[PDB]
């Protein structure tokens, strides 16, 4: 049968739950996971990149901050079509990776969050026309998923009519972009991905912590302050730079070690 043309961009929010796991997790990502992944999807993924997270900002834990990276794929077909389950060579995946990322405790873990989006942002809510000449961005990418029982339309209205205006009003915030998560692909619990730019960590904190104190706590709140969602389960985020050297289909040359 036919395979549907389904161009999409996906994001995976990759945490590292203890600094002692960092070297191990980073090695696996760069020495093992890169070549396994390219080997599988080179013919139908047009871009595969990792954006290392900036250092976790103050209170970043409450936003499900990914302390390793964002992993980004651009797909031409849906990775969730059942026919794609078959692979000649499966990924090398030690169970410890799940420990390093916090999906399982060492002995509740946090879920694996893999959000599919259209390739192009659906809503441009502040900063249209910004160029790279306008300067370096502190790009805070956040995904959120309303808790069970919350009407999605109610959640949407709160996001766009209460949360976003506070971003728009902040001079520290230079860009706001948003898309709905393509829930139909893989059952992701997330509903929205937003990306919110600042000049710097102090700007992020001023807006996302201080200015947000002005919001009323919703009745579905899972924590007392914005984002009001359970970290790592109903909100994940990362702050990243404009540029990454890990544009892996173009730039990988094997795991070359320092002398």
């Amino acid at each position: 049968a036919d395979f549907k043309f389904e161009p999409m961009r996906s994001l995976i929010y990759v945490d590292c739950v203890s600094e002692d796991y960092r070297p191990k997790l980073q090695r696996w990502i760069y020495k093992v996971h890169i070549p396994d992944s390219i080997s599988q999807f080179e013919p139908y993924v047009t871009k595969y990149a990792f954006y290392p997270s900036f250092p976790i900002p103050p209170q970043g834990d409450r936003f499900g901050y990914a302390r390793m990276q964002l992993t980004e794929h651009h797909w031409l077909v849906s990775d969730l079509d059942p026919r794609l389950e078959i692979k000649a060579i499966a990924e090398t995946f030690p169970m410890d990776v799940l420990v390093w990322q916090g999906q399982i405790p060492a002995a509740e873990g946090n879920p694996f969050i893999f959000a599919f989006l259209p390739m192009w942002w659906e809503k441009d809510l502040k900063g249209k026309g910004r160029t790279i000449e306008d300067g370096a961005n502190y790009r805070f990418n956040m995904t959120i998923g309303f808790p069970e029982g919350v009407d999605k339309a109610e959640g949407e209205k709160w996001l766009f009519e209460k949360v976003v205006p506070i971003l728009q009003a902040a001079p520290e915030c230079t860009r706001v972009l948003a898309s709905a998560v393509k829930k139909d692909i893989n059952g992701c619990v997330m509903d929205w991905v937003l990306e919110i730019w600042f000049e710097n960590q102090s700007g992020w904190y001023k807006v996302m912590v201080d200015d947000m104190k002005a919001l009323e706590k919703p009745s579905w709140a899972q924590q007392d302050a914005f984002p009001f969602l359970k970290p790592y389960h109903n909100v994940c985020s990362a702050a990243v730079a404009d540029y990454t050297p890990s544009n892996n289909l173009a730039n990988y040359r094997g795991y070359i070690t320092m002398r």
Copy 2:
């Protein structure tokens, strides 16, 4: 909603209207425009290349000759889908680029920006089928034309293929003729056809495209006295290019490295 699979090749005809602008325009193209462009479309454009124009031949101005280059994209989806208007980072674009290229006069008339979408494969192979790269170096004259307002498109097509092309077919100096209809429906381009017409060199191009074409009758809709009978830069644009470019940008770009 779905995005349509729409594989296309497009061409942009990039002029440089004064030699004094060449260094600035070329810098912008190679230092600024490449990375901005790659940054936007890497996931859905499979090839992005520039083909620098050979030196303008005698009387090339009458053919809307692009004195900088042809820019070529191969798309998997239509760049004019309105959902593609949203971009995280917009292109860095000094207004002077438009002066350098002739879209706006410097401080009588502007020339339009000509961006023609085509199928990835030529629709008509009218001379030279089977020529390979071992047969020799080509002077590849790519020309796009658009008939003026009021001219019936089927009449112009008929003229093109029954009066103009037979002259190319008869000339031993012309080694290849290829043609496609412009996909009008993507972006409202005024052009109707893109042709590519190969010669051995500039002198061959001239013998055929200037001297042999003198035998044509001037059409009633002509906007200049001689072939192509179309208003330069508005209803005809062109460039002569080589078979090869070093600027295959998605594969070969390594940043703006400067000569020592």
Copy 3:
């Protein structure tokens, strides 16, 4: 008119019928055919690679063994759409190449066909070895394509392959992986019906299974030779054994025909 999105993987079985032709054939492949091919399809082929064949194993001739390579493309559109026949620059392809590959006879007083099999990009049947990773070790990957002869009912052949042949693969502890797909016959009229890939540790393991263990099979009535694969070499069966890795991943790795000093 529209062009249909048709993601596929294709394999070409490239033989070299005398060692005296190897240098010339290899030169043409790497010096002439690579750049000609990339020049045509770069915008709509996402991967273009060559997998050199391991040395032909004992009795490999009976399996239509490709002594040069497998050539692999991953396509986004069908190469057989008639609109794709038109090319600005055609590829340089002398009839000598067909001699070297065994498609035509070498000098004036039967050829083997050109086998170009189109497949979905993902294997349709995963029959043994599911979950095998690269960490499990080096594979001797035996890729084979078969086509039942004229007048053999295709469902009958399928059933023989999957109910009589594959169980022998399953029982051999030497065989670490069996994958299969149906050939997309509709694209180009290819006479092959199935492509299988069957992994071993090494040549000895291949031989043990594909020669010794297969002696247990009854000879089919349609058989074109006495022993498995029971099909006419190069015409109804072609194969190659290849490694997990190739350096000739041509759209990423090619830098021109640089010669040794």
Copy 4:
């Protein structure tokens, strides 16, 4: 006149003194500094790489911890030959970079530390034979230079009598390498570069903080605890991974920005 074949490895310890400067500094490094540098030295530098620093460990400030990266060059000729001062295009270097790196203070500035070494380590003090298969390393590279007035042979004797034995005895320490800094190139105040590997940050701390508490404080000490040297002036360091994606002569493709 002739140019001398002078193969060397150099290290620059690049700090980022406030998180607010991180996006700006990182942009300048990857957008501006890479192409300017490649443009000058491509013909006589065989490797040019950046190794981003792991997160600053507890008490890392006392070790002159570089919070951006180590910058590494491999040279075929001495960059300090006066003939090399002439360049067709000079680098684009705003003064603000000096503020971001702490060369210009927000009390006193920190010096620009640029140490030249032989390409090969001079002393293999622990872990000879270790391969990449043995696992991920937390590579702590530290340069030290003894205070003015201190005899270099005295400093050396202290280092070898008192410090090296502790590193060798600790099970947490899997590798120790050292080289003398080439003084004669650029007047660098540093005297040694050491590289000391651990499994992780916790192992680093146990050895470099807890085990070192047994040392007596030398008479020339500029701080109370090991390394006993003035942070950023007489000691600089960074912990890095085995691999970097920023192998710039091979891997750079211009400043491609995230979508």
Copy 5:
């Protein structure tokens, strides 16, 4: 015996004497000459690049203007050591290349092959020290001169640096002046100096190198009436080039991929 470490930059001034030869010469350069070259010297040349020439300016013929490109190598060893004469595979070099470049006539006295070795770093920085790429696009005019037979080299030098270079220094149109003595010991090159002189554009180049130079007295050894006073293509060669080239051949070449 040992090989001497001899880091050097060389420049070859490549002309194209008729536009009709341009497709053939360009093809040989990019299709045949690149891979033969890389094949021979990859282990001991750290950079190999082509800088295509900007359009020949008015009166550029009098400066031995290279209508194709500058070819630039960075060597770790001297290519003229007799031990390097032995090569497994010799380059493919049709006699027609000598015609296209003007070393011999087609069927026009021949012009010599000018291959100038230099140190990797400019020896004299005479104007514009500290200029960065941020300061703007440069029209980089690279010129090599060799004084005629019989002329004392010290006298030539003093004229160059006390009469010629002060006119460049005085001109606000000239943003950069760099110079090196040619390493004549390597290959017997007839040239004595390479200079690179930057302007904003062709108009600036003309104002300085034609108009401002009219103030110079004609020397007694002059081979033509106006500056540079030297026989074009024999005692003076040059090219105007951009800051950047896409043809950084050891990094950027991917074979001779042809346009569709």
Copy 6:
């Protein structure tokens, strides 16, 4: 202390002694050995390449035929300087690699690891000077020999150049003969000469190296009855290779990507 500039080319003759070891040896070479190697020497090796051997020809076993590949490095400094013994990360090297290559027997005699350093340029060009790539595909037979213990080296050299090479020159099937003395001082290699001898193909190689060589007298030091008269794999090693390899590892390696 100083490091001496010592540009050299080295060859390692890599055997695979049983076809059952091929997939394992090949994997180690490409998956494990390439990155460990590049990690160590990127800053002072300018080229690192593998040339896979063609199929062993009839009687090739008598020539110490390397059934895997030639490994080729171009060095800027001597890898055997004792300062280079120290390495941050040592290469991953399982004992089995020695079994696969025949250095140690699996359970009849081991063969030595042959690693021959040479100057970057061939010292002697004895046939076929001027041959270009346009002249056609070559079957390049690279052979190293070392005279047995007790044979005076000058006597061996005399035999090689006065008796063996003339047979190569007499054969029209032999299109090239190149030779260098092995730099024995670097690492104690027991080999004395590396030759490269080209043919059209295997049948040409056989005609010359087996049939034509029957005319030679057997030397008193012979270790086997026929040419090369030297103990296979101990005093002669060789491989036949193509002109091109895709395994130019410093430029072409992108990690161990596995077939789908």
